[PDB]
RNA sequence: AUUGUACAUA
């Protein structure tokens, strides 16, 4: 049952069409997907008295816009190209649905751009309505990105509670799918007194979250992007153990991170650690050639060993090439060593 | 990921 008006527009006999002459029916063109991109479209070079009409008839359907698949959008061009008291005027008729907004499919995706156009002040209100319902948002596939715009968008002072909510559920949500996405937004974004806490259990589980399809990742992160001192403690986790984790699916990535962003003593001590060890009655060196992932460890560190220490590594390899050629994952090593040998 | 792993609407 549309009206005859978007009929003829959907059907395309309208090719002059103004914000103007759709009056009384924004709110039904916003509902579909074509007059909804015709608004959006619209809005930008629109004049303020076009945009004033436009808002007038939004804002009184606004949460059903918000949640609405094509709705949204005209509700997300407005915090774009709206005046400060369209903008705050919206941010209020969101002030007390925050929570269920952010679960939603759609209203979700408004609360992510409110949150980067609106005061600080208002972010911070919006912000608030989260609290009591962290973990919950977090877990959740909707919540969890607007959890992560919020560490991103306000002022890490006002985040607070979200690090109490992660008190001892670091390493569950780490694991998490979602989880792990908002622990590494936390570490780039919160304040030293807060990423402190989140490190300590981080570090607790390295040996777990390692060797997790979405753990591996969060260590990987701090490899990345964090302080030499937690650098170290993972380097020091995985120092003595760079064998096995080495042929392991998803550890195998997190000791390439180590070969590589540990220091230059740090580093050196981990390529030589492969050297030396003896896995069973041959050579550790010769385990990690042929295995389907450790060619990628044994590979990094050819890369970032220096000079003297590649030198040895790649003669410690010679004796094996007549072997590598015969496993398919030695060959890839192989390949390596052939050129400057 | 190239011989190997994770993010949501027309």
Redesign the pocket.
């Given at each position: 049952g549309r009206s005859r008006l978007l009929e003829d527009f959907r059907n395309n006999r309208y090719p002059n069409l103004q914000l103007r002459e759709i009056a009384g029916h924004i709110m039904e063109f916003s509902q579909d997907?074509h007059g909804?991109?015709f608004i959006?479209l619209k809005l930008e070079r629109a004049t303020p008295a076009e945009r004033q009409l436009v808002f007038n008839e939004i804002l009184q359907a606004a949460y059903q816009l918000m949640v609405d698949?094509?709705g949204?959008?005209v509700i997300?061009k407005f915090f774009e190209f709206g005046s400060l008291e369209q903008k705050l005027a919206l941010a209020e008729r969101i002030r007390g649905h925050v929570l269920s907004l952010a679960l939603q499919?759609?209203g979700?995706?408004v609360i992510?751009?409110a949150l980067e156009f609106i005061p600080s002040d208002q972010q911070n209100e919006m912000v608030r309505e989260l609290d009591g319902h962290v973990l919950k948002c977090v877990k959740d596939?909707?919540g969890?990105?607007?959890v992560?715009?919020c560490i991103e968008c306000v002022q890490p002072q006002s985040l607070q509670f979200i690090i109490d909510a992660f008190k001892g559920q670091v390493f569950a949500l780490s694991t998490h799918?979602?989880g792990?996405?908002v622990i590494?937004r936390i570490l780039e974004h919160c304040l030293p007194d807060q990423t402190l806490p989140i490190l300590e259990e981080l570090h607790q589980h390295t040996e777990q979250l390692v060797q997790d399809?979405?753990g591996?990742?969060?260590i990987?992160?701090v490899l990345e992007h964090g302080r030499p001192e937690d650098k170290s403690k993972i380097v020091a986790e995985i120092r003595g153990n760079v064998l096995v984790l080495?042929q392991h699916?998803?550890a195998?990535?997190?000791v390439?991170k180590c070969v590589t962003h540990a220091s230059r003593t740090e580093r050196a001590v981990l390529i030589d650690e492969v050297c030396t060890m003896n896995d069973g009655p041959h050579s550790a060196l010769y385990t990690m050639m042929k295995d389907?992932?450790?060619?990628?460890?044994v590979?990094?560190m050819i890369d970032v060993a220096e000079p003297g220490q590649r030198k040895i590594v790649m003669h410690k390899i010679r004796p094996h090439i007549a072997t590598l050629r015969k496993y398919?994952?030695g060959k890839?090593?192989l390949?390596k060593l052939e050129k400057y040998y």
């Open positions: 997907q909804s991109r959006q698949v094509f949204n959008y997300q499919m759609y979700c995706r992510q751009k596939q909707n969890n990105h607007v992560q715009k799918p979602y792990c996405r590494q399809q979405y591996n990742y969060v990987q992160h080495s699916k998803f195998s990535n997190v390439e389907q992932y450790a060619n990628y460890v590979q990094k398919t994952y890839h090593i390949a």
